[model samples]
Target chain A: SQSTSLYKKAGLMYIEVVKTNKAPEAIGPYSQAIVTGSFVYTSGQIPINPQTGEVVDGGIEEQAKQVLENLKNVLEAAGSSLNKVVKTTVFIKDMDSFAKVNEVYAKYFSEPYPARSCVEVSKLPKGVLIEIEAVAIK
Target chain B: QSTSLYKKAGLMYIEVVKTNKAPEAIGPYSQAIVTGSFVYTSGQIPINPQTGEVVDGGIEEQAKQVLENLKNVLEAAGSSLNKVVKTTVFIKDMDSFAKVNEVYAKYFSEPYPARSCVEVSKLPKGVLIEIEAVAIK
Candidate 1:
């Protein structure tokens, strides 16, 4: 088997675990983001206030903004930007909040917005209203 | 930005991974998209490829079938479960997390791939679980 085969580092094929103080650290056994090739894939980011170690206040609107900010920071740490994102999976606490979330989401990007799938979930870690994970070209 | 950037820049950049052993994609997206370095699979549910119906029984049964489908899809893309780097599991109920974990651990080896699991209000096909993955190609 090649060095890059399954858990092995085969030169350029090795996976790079991305970390930065700009984003909250992983709450579980995962990296803030993983950079491989020309892309960066980030773990789902909740509305944790990196400076305060607490979930942000307000509501879904506030949580959604913080989530995207965390994601933006994670992507920048990996040499990518929000405009470069190609897709995103948004998990929300309520489907009815979709329009409100999108209103906040639209403020972050201009055109060629990344393809997205938003689904209502039963719960999110820390009881945050939204959690967003993304894939972006680096 | 040039629109050509999104165009098929020759066949070397991306390829579609397909296999009859796994359920066909129910949507417009491919079963898996193989890029220069990774394979991204569409979320896998418990639909039996042979019958096109969601598997019956408990979450454990549903989870097992989903994992099997994912394995087949990954292997078809010149990658294996062992090479997977990340997985996002969308489960219908959080109460069955332990059972799903038991079934999941049986498939992937130690130093398991990074994962995030959440209980979704619903899943495609109304299945108990859906899982998607990213693997080294």
Candidate 2:
């Protein structure tokens, strides 16, 4: 629904939802991201090929690449960008893949690299190897 | 005891939130950050403040312990769990999903926060669950 995504609220100015085809559609009943007065909140993005609607095939590197790719689009759609990200969470299938994950993340974010938490999850939706969600200044 | 504030390019204030009621941050991250009208928290594991260890027992005990710690963390940031807008829940496995939700439901009332639940391979300190959230008054 490309309808008006903003809602007035207390403390903050208002809240708005972001919808974009450039990023994969929300798998569940979530907007790709929500924009408040000063921040944009995004749902976890798995490496589902946006066009194919399938988990991108391959390992952590490939998965992280696609996940970040989807995240960038989602943030941009909210009138934010990767450089404006303030925080992030990276969920992977294996902790050992941590180093590889950072290499991919580096391409998408700069330092003071968005306060982040990276943990290995046993499984992700569709069993993808990695997933990432973010919050950015808007 | 004092909040650290920063002004970003957009000229909004982001403040670091902390409290001794919960475990000290073992890393570079803050317990939470307050910006605009919301506070974003780091994923919390089931660590007890008095005992200084993962809470005892199975998913039931750990889940409750985690929520208690989170409640304090949110309060420290000038917000409450009920003010939370969304949360990401990472559990050790899907089997505990039912058990976790039963305990989780006790913490937040209706118009529940937007939530995402997933089974993760492992968590910090090898704990069974971890939760991170965004809250607004």
Candidate 3:
């Protein structure tokens, strides 16, 4: 069933599915993160607290912090870290809250900030205000 | 001049994709960035490259155009939807999911890539939907 298999001829490429309790378990069909070659790609991480299994309380500031924290954990689990991130995509329910979110975001990533794109969305999963996904060097 | 250029440790070769077949980037980013193992596309809207305007019609029309643009961009980067590993869809409304799904399902075959779709308040250029992707190169 080589033809039916997903990888096919590129089966030899190195890839690893990252799992960690430090981040919220994926609520849908996705892994917490995936490591391929020298990079780790994480699924969109919302503000859900893995331990509480609920979206954290407070505004975009708190939610943004939690989302980055979750990403930090997921990256660490994949043998990468925030400092190693190369790119990130941020989705928010309201673009008006961008400044507040950036305040918290700046605290997590330092100089040589990963390239990023931010956009306003009508809604996010679980009705959270923000969601973030990242690509980090492994 | 080399010293003026930015460089970092573990920097992978970055290839910028530019294709007239796809809508040109409306902003400061490239149509896509190809790295060692993957090609990352900027969010693609349904603007017709030839007209430089949002394609007319409903969500279905817009979705198809966006997918086509993505196809051209990926192909330009030496990748395709079949090689796509993940995609993020931002839609203006969830009601159009079925319509968008129909078009999306046609372009991507078996063992379809991982995806995340959400309703967004707005999109660039007032478009109905936007999609970005990460694909194996």
Q: Which ten residues in a row have the lowest lDDT in candidate 3 chain B?
A: B1-10
Rank by TM-score (best first): 2, 3, 1
| Candidate 1, B1-137: lDDT as tens digits | 11112313234344556688888753324566665677777778898899988888889899999999999989987999999999989888889799999999999997699999877897665678888888897
lDDT of 3 by residue, A1-138 (tens): 102112213466766678788889865667888877777889999999889999999988889999999999999988888776666888888877777887788888744455455688667898999999988776
- Looking at model 1, how many pairs of residues clash? 0
Candidate 3 per-residue lDDT, tens place, B38-137, comes to 7788788898999999999989999999999999989987999999998988898898699999999999998799999988777666788888888988
Which regions of candidate 1 deviate over 4 angstroms?
A1-37, A40-118, A122-138, B1-12
lDDT of 3 at B62: 98
Better of 1 and 2 by TM-score: 2
Best-matching candidate per DockQ: 2
lDDT of 2 by residue, B1-137 (tens): 55555536577655667788887764445677776787788888889987789888999999998898889989998899899999889888788699999999999998899999877778777888988888984
Model 3's CAPRI class is incorrect
Worst 10 residues of 2 chain B by lDDT: B1-10
Model 2: docking quality category: incorrect
Task: Write the candidate numbers in order of decreasing DockQ.
Answer: 2, 3, 1
Candidate 1 lDDT over A78-119, as tens digits, reads 777776665577888887777788788887753334544456
lDDT of 2: 0.80
Q: Please provide TM-scores, in order, for all candidate models, with all chains considered together.
A: 0.56, 0.64, 0.59
